[PDB]
Amino acid sequence: MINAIRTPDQRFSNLDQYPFSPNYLDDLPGYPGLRAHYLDEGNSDAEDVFLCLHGEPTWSYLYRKMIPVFAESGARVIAPDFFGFGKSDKPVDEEDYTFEFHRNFLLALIERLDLRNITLVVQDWGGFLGLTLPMADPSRFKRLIIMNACLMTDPVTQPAFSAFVTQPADGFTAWKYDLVTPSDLRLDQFMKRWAPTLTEAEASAYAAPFPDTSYQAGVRKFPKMVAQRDQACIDISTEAISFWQNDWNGQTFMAIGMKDKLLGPDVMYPMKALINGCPEPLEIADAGHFVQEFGEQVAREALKHFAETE
Template identity: 65%
Template structure:
């Protein structure tokens, strides 16, 4: 049985701009003893689904500005917390946190909730994982909204990433509120606290610590699965795509996103968000509204 910690509910009380009720799933196959959390907003009976996947080191709080915009269309809006993040349980061993561990959880969650007609919304690790999901179940996916992310097919060594990795891995005590303010300087103190809320102390941060190491040295399964996503997106993808780029992001900004635009079949010219850095969702209301306009929703 995987050893996990569960963040006390008191840590999530009265978070700024996060009025959403919790939903939990337990005992998915291979995840026995682990409780996962997801938001389920909008119309639960809708045929249209927005699936919002966060990255490192965030959680569903990241999508607080986009969820209401998508829900107003009458769609169902699902925003999971990856295992080890947010209100989901936190496996304490870094060895638990592999690419396939997190990817398979998302695949099982989609099947468990029987999600179809999915508009996939991804950024950072939400994309590193999420962009490999449709190839396994293409009939479930209809649209893509992609922000500052890519596919992980080789070790990443660029200076901006190495600084990011160092900021997470090196400190004995990782102050996530301070980290988030560095990479999302528009955050106020309450918002920065909310991002740090799931992690009362270092014992809760195994997933946060592991993610950058996985980017620096991806496992073979990650490379193979991610490489298989390339022909899917370039030749097999039949859905509609919207791209938004946080232009101040030195790690997964314009250069990487230009490559992704060329890779994804039918991807139009991206929406440039001049003031946004890595966490494009902090400008999420404008991005969501532009995406809906693009899709005529």
């Protein structure tokens, strides 16, 4: 019904530091015939579940250094790959991807696996989407781990969540230009630019999912939805502000990648004020946009923070 293609399994043969077994679901309600890939690590009967959401233009591969720290703590870790990324199937038309299409996939996933006692782990698009999930069923969420992200509200209600789009020129403008303009987009070279510490092996793991441009419709669409917020997204993200400010009663841990040009300190401090009970943030000086690349530290510190409250 929704024309999609699937990445040949062979593309993932030689992944570096990725020993996690695949789990798939192809019976989601609303997503008929589309297969979703997710990691389900640690004790599947754990009381605590960490739901790790990725963003643009990555995949679960991005949480590979956090996963084992969470799992060794006794938790069940879930890390899905959004349609269009990693090992999930990729709709071929950029028009199929919308804020709600990915949002609904997430609610569908949570219902299907019946996840409870969730510690939400977000960043980038994983947070734009993820920060709007607790208000739909608050009883299932208990903690939040937030890395560089915010809500895609309208420019007036929150100017900090709009300003980064236009400035600086080497910030979101450069990122977007790099992503939606080349006709021969190489995600390994893009990653090495925006995540300078990656090795060549890690870099290639982010290009693994896309053998050629036909597979990258979802990759091309994310940047454009940041820049051109559809109504439902604005209403949805605006009502979530209300949720974090007055309804949230959970424990929160915030980590900021200080070298980020897009969603750094000028976007994080304002987020921090909006989340009821958010404590002092852990600032990671050598981290860029992809804070997960310095994940072992973030994962340990967060469990250390959450422990000193149990």
